[PDB]
Design a protein around this ligand. Sequence first.
Ligand SMILES: Nc1ncnc2c1ncn2[C@@H]1O[C@H](COP(=O)(O)OP(=O)(O)OP(O)(O)=S)[C@@H](O)[C@H]1O
Ligand SMILES: Nc1ncnc2c1ncn2[C@@H]1O[C@H](COP(=O)(O)OP(=O)(O)OP(O)(O)=S)[C@@H](O)[C@H]1O
Ligand SMILES: Nc1ncnc2c1ncn2[C@@H]1O[C@H](COP(=O)(O)OP(=O)(O)OP(O)(O)=S)[C@@H](O)[C@H]1O
Ligand SMILES: Nc1ncnc2c1ncn2[C@@H]1O[C@H](COP(=O)(O)OP(=O)(O)O)[C@@H](O)[C@H]1O
Ligand SMILES: [Mg+2]
Ligand SMILES: [Mg+2]
Ligand SMILES: [Mg+2]
Lengths: 325, 329, 319, 348, 261, 261
Amino acid sequence: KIRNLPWVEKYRPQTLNDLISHQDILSTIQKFINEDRLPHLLLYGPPGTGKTSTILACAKQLYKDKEFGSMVLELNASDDRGIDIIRGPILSFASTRTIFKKGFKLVILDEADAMTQDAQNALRRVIEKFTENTRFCLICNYLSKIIPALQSRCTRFRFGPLTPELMVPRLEHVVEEEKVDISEDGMKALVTLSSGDMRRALNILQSTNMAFGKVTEETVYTCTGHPLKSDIANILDWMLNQDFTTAYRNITELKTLKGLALHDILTEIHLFVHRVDFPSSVRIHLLTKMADIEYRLSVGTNEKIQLSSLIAAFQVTRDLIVAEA
Amino acid sequence: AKPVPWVEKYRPKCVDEVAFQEEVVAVLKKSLEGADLPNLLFYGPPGTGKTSTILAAARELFGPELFRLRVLELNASDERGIQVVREKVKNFAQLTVSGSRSDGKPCPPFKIVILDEADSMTSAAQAALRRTMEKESKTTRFCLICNYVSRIIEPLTSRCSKFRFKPLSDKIQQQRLLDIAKKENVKISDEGIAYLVKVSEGDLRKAITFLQSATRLTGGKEITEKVITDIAGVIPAEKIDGVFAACQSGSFDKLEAVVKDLIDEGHAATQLVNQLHDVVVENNLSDKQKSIITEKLAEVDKCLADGADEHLQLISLCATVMQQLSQNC
Amino acid sequence: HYELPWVEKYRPVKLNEIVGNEDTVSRLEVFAREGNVPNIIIAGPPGTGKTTSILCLARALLGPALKDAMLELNASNDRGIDVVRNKIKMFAQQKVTLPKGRHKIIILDEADSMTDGAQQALRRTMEIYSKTTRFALACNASDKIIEPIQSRCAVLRYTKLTDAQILTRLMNVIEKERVPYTDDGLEAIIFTAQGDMRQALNNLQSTFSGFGFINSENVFKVCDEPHPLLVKEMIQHCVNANIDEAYKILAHLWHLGYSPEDIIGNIFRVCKTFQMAEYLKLEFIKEIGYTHMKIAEGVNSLLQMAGLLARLCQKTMAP
Amino acid sequence: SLWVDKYRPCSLGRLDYHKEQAAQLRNLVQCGDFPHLLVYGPSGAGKKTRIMCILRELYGVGVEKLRIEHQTITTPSKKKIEISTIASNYHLEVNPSDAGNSDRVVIQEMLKTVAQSQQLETNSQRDFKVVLLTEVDKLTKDAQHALRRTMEKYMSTCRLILCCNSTSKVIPPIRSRCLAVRVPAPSIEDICHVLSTVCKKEGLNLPSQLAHRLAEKSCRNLRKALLMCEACRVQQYPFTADQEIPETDWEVYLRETANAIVSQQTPQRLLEVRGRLYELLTHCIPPEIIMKGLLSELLHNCDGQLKGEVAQMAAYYEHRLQLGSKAIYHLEAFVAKFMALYKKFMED
Amino acid sequence: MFEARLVQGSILKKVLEALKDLINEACWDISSSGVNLQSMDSSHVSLVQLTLRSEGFDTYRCDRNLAMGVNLTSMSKILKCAGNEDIITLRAEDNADTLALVFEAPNQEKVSDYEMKLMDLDVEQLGIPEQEYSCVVKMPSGEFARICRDLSHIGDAVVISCAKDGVKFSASGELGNGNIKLSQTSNVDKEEEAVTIEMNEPVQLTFALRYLNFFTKATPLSSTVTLSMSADVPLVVEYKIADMGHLKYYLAPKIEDEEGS
Amino acid sequence: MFEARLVQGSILKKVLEALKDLINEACWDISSSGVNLQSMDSSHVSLVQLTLRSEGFDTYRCDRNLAMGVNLTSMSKILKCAGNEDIITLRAEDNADTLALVFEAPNQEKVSDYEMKLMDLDVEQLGIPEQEYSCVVKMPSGEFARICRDLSHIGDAVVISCAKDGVKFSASGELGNGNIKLSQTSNVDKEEEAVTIEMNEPVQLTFALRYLNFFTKATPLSSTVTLSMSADVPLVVEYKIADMGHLKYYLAPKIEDEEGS
DNA sequence: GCAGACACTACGAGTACATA
DNA sequence: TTTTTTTTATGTACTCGTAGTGTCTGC
Ligand SMILES: Nc1ncnc2c1ncn2[C@@H]1O[C@H](COP(=O)(O)OP(=O)(O)OP(O)(O)=S)[C@@H](O)[C@H]1O
Ligand SMILES: Nc1ncnc2c1ncn2[C@@H]1O[C@H](COP(=O)(O)OP(=O)(O)OP(O)(O)=S)[C@@H](O)[C@H]1O
Ligand SMILES: Nc1ncnc2c1ncn2[C@@H]1O[C@H](COP(=O)(O)OP(=O)(O)OP(O)(O)=S)[C@@H](O)[C@H]1O
Ligand SMILES: Nc1ncnc2c1ncn2[C@@H]1O[C@H](COP(=O)(O)OP(=O)(O)O)[C@@H](O)[C@H]1O
Ligand SMILES: [Mg+2]
Ligand SMILES: [Mg+2]
Ligand SMILES: [Mg+2]
């Protein structure tokens, strides 16, 4: 049947084989499940890489639908996870048996970086004393916000960013399930603008399919509003090759016609700077000035003056690069 | 029969009345047709129409009788703590989707949670929205409205489909202002509407406010360019020429005199920074002088954004441009 | 029955099975053999064997009377101000018949979580009933335990386990489990352990379950290299104003998925104990804090970290 | 009553200066659909007088019947914070900066209960109420972010007139939602005309030289000019042209502080200047005005090639003072930087 | 259209008072047989099975089957202002979100229509094994409420044992031990106060006192309680209402470990 | 000089806490007919009239029309020090700025005297129009306090509808709508429960919950309460208290939504 | 049958701190 | 060889004092 769902939730890897990237980690967790030797897991990485979906597929593989409510205790940041919850419901779930069928239980603590340090210190002996009865899975995006005791007690798997070569078949599966007309440059634009994020890949795909009806490079870069790489090359050429007035006029006309934002222009110019064989002092000056301009855009500032400063940071270094020779 | 200001009289009551935001309007019209609406993130400059677009979309999706049952609006004028997200948002997200439109129009099978001004929401309260958005996506949708997307955490950025609201172009803004002036039976010259769409800088709310205030000040006759220039707080060009003459003189006493005259005349320092930048990028100065003057202008604009004193920032900017103008002399 | 993981399955049950800190563990063996153990506080890094040493000492001292003469309190318990007054003091007053040289042991594991008032109420019950009861404390941050409690106990400090000390226990686990291995795979396990026996056992069990063999490629396919081991040379390149190699290390850490907060935390951790000039270190730390305020404010991109690296390179060239 | 309060104009037709702006403000509020107002300008220009004249144009004479209303507002920390509001039967005057950093609670709770209820009488009163928010530049950005949706949801039954000195401290979401009304300071001729009409209404004779000196010394502040003119008539009833004008104590204390700065450049003199700045800060003088007075006095003793660097240092340390929370650190940092620069200039 | 009419208002008060600090939210499953409720607690340790028969209600009609998950803290506030001698009507439509509660005042003069917003939780059905038990004990509910309250003063976990002789309650605490052994109290004038042993095999298990004390707040529902115990299946506290249905309370045993010595 | 003497200590101990969180000051106006009090809330919503006639006092002396203002922050804490069934008197000199009240200490042995400073506030009498209301109804006192408490758990604003059948209290919230309909309670033994309707014109107005909860804190003073509603006149909550006078409340209605077709 | 006393839990209030 | 005090905005955790209230004792 059809459901009114976002494509990040309509297409979720309910089984472990539907995930794409981390094949060694998923194979090791599958061999943990098959041997019934599942340890305390610590899944960390950037968002959108498949940490929640992995443990949900593992929980559905370990437990049946008639025993899932008494075997899995899933708590996240939307629930209260204070120290009275660690001493209360979590300890009573860990220290007791099951109801229907005998087996080890699972405590899923999603977004474990948001927990307080008192709760994390109270979690240590609950994990250690009841290893035979229950298992604890900790999910976080920041490993520095989890205490080193819980990092020692749980074996850590890094769910790194998804490579664009592996995000193509899952996007093709979503495309062929949703009847989406997409070209090759549309797929390249999706996997370039995602930057190791499967969630925003499906979000950009759904928004581009609804906005235009076809997914090409121009439709993706128009719906997202991201500048094209030819536009960034033209901006760099104007900033490095002519005077202040003509570069200001050309960059202002390009930003007015294309409807560009200075944040993405700064990001792509920062990526272009390290590719250009600059002198070291010129590179340091450009990085400091671009970081200052990027910091200035986080408040109620005028974007035209910051665009002029972005032009100025290269108009200063024109003479230094040329006189370096 | 009470009068209403034109920003609320000409608020978009439907998606088709929203101007220039073509991609999100097409997405919302597809959601009106019955397509799968994802979680939305609206960001951009003020006055571009982020709130009016989602309010028009919600009132077209649910209608008058189901707007109170399917739409929850939470903004910075009400308390949004961690407990408000844990209790008020989560219990609303877990409610059933029921109730049908009595006019025969189709109704989508979800609710809409509108979190306007998500910049002011704390990082702890934003972390509690993550599994609420993921688990309850079968029965509710979330629209986050903000101005700076860096003030929303990366999980909520990844969970929402981002739509950036561009500043309105001169053609679309001029067309909308001429339509509003046509419906209000007032007349405005072409130079007046050109200076209005130049002054408003893509802010359509500012343009509508200036048009209504110029109509009230004018009384009903022709709206010229002088009333627009006086009503916008635009500094005259003779003051800018006097500032640059005091900088070319190389004396700090005349610099203090023109800075005190501009401060005592009540001119805003942001308008002075904009006009000084417009003169600086369009003259016959060298590239290095223009470069460090524009960088000082950016620093002064950043300091004015953080609520520094206008007099000290303006005299520092004037000292810098005076040093640049008297260095080559 | 469900088999325990190798961290808990191969927990030592005698004090002679505990590797590392040979003098302190040997003195604990002597005190378990003879008796009359004083109050002790064992401090050190996680996974060193403090709780294992305390529990093995309590098992060797008490034996069959472990159920009635031992009180084990964790951070998962309450242990507030009213537990020290009404449960610890009542257990210290409790009459338990024990052999000569043996006292009741009140084990207060992870004493960092205990509040200041509870530790103030813990002093006189430590001092009065010491003829019949004893205290065994374990902690990580020993400064959180107050000075009067540390004066009332023999403060033991555990250091990080070396490569050979972890390697001996790993060889024992391998010979108990018949794990095929190579030398460089065990060196990779030691390198990923970083002085932690828990992480060594977890990485060994993960590599054995996922691949069935211990070489360097099977260890590094599931485990990871430690973070500050490359941040150290990134800071070294920032000292010599080498912005290109520092950005290469920064981009390599960025493409592995590390958040900017973790990267700048490792940068501050390296710069706190780096070997350079003191004034240069102070201005480096001030620049790190200035960038960390921007990261916590909301702006956190690769351009901000590159600007931080460029500012750290400038601070060298601006004496 | 003093001369600042006895001869204040009541309606827009009795204003001595900015008469074209007075006619424009009369034409603005006649129909009743006028938007939110942002009355801004220098202190003493006449912003509050024109706001009260706008309220006189909207409602009747009953807006002058003011009374003190005491409100108790509960923080999220459950600490009772007391604020005072001046209210009439037609409008309310709120200064949320009196609550300090808890002004966001005042905006979220006190203003929303005012806006959510319509007026009792709709015949003597009009269809909408006016809320006067005074010194909105001193509001934090959280309170201004809390302000913006109330300004759009209830703008048919509740209007807002915001008063401030600088619009740079007002966030662009608030500035986009309201019409900005600029009230400049009166000129020397305008202040001389006002003082001459006040002295003629008092039966006195005011010379043009004394009136010009009172206008020049007041720095185009008509309130301070009227106070100085009344002080000059209590001090000496024959208005001489070269009659001395009394001075404020904190201004001459700031001048002597800057003279102590330029007299000696030592850490001991820096400690003495820190004590003087502590004495200035304890008397509830704002630190930006301390920076402005220091820069106004230090640049008189500097050479022509040194003033720009001192002005840039003063702006930089005032920006760091606005970013920070302890003003004495940034004030002493600016004084120490000026002492180092002055010693380097004098020794070379 | 679902329309259930409570003949008495005291039973709905006494059911909800027992589940107030235990059941997170009420899952009313409605069919032609009656009203069912199988919901776990917040800690996923206890399970509550409630079955109200159709013949117990004053009037009961049900066209199509419904599953109306609703909040219980919201249901607690509307049941405090409910009389103990009046009829309460439960109403809900086919495709609506409002659960209507219509009753009378304690002053008995005004209607009181209390609507509740239904929740949309997707809860999987828990499979009750319905197997035999190695111990079945009939017991008064007043005595079972007293004994679990009396042993909460000594410890926090009770080692409740049963055999051919009778049920035995033990609680090892900080002060010491409290051992209660009651057997064969059927030789009294009343019929509710009786201890009857049905099954054979002895079983010793340890349970938390917090959940057992929550189970004893259903004491005014039934004058006699039934305890079921076995070595594998959990402990069942079966209340049987006289003319309305039955209530079952499940509680998992705690993990206990023998000393190595 | 002003001197008055009460007949019971509970006629001031039960009315002052109703004004404790409602109004910030208690302005007593002294006249030959009696003592008047008309104070308005700081939010310009609530308005309380309290007049006690001179015949109900034990004794009463009034030669000049004097008005005194005192704050609720200091008179509340000395009210709990005073007794319940003791006698209370109030004394005020003509020229002094001190209000002295003499009563009995709760040990019933010694004279306890407290002094309060007179706050000089320049207020004016608003003046009730005393117009004929569109609704007049009679409700019990103790039952009406239980009405507004029940709608306090639902929403922050209640809706009052008074047609010819009775008075309907409604509150639509995030939990669900709570509707009651008090009507036709004339067949009771006690005369204070006689619910009756004295007018014909219906009206529907919404009011704030918080001040109506403050209005129900003066309920044990009288046996009944009288409610008066109109189209634009504020709601009147009238208490006929004992024998010495009557108490009157006023509450401004809330805003109405733009529900035009 | 109704007034006084006993401990019971829920709730209001004050305070500290949050890193390596 | 030298010691007083309240500001930062939330969120959590701890600790202590207080007040309706269910239940028991008694004439
Ligand atoms: N490896 C993957 N393979 C396939 N789809 C994926 C993968 N990772 C993410 N997705 C998609 O993205 C959605 C969200 O994935 P999540 O598991 O929630 O990511 P996540 O790692 O949990 O990120 P955070 O840290 O929780 S915000 C899923 O429902 C899928 O549609
Ligand atoms: N795109 C638009 N089309 C039509 N009218 C618009 C548009 N944008 C703004 N307006 C008008 O200006 C008013 C302000 O629109 P908003 O939706 O509040 O803008 P905004 O994006 O919410 O600004 P911020 O960021 O909240 S301060 C609307 O009520 C309209 O009257
Ligand atoms: N010195 C050691 N010798 C042998 N095994 C050890 C040693 N240290 C740790 N282990 C193993 O690691 C497990 C955990 O050791 P613990 O003593 O519980 O850690 P810990 O020293 O208490 O550190 P924290 O601060 O409590 S995380 C033990 O069960 C052993 O399997
Ligand atoms: N048009 C005018 N004619 C005479 N006096 C004026 C006029 N406008 C302002 N003033 C005087 O100048 C002073 C300015 O103070 P105020 O009106 O509060 O403005 P601001 O709020 O800018 O200080 C007032 O005391 C008032 O008496
Ligand atoms: Mg997740
Ligand atoms: Mg908005
Ligand atoms: Mg330990």
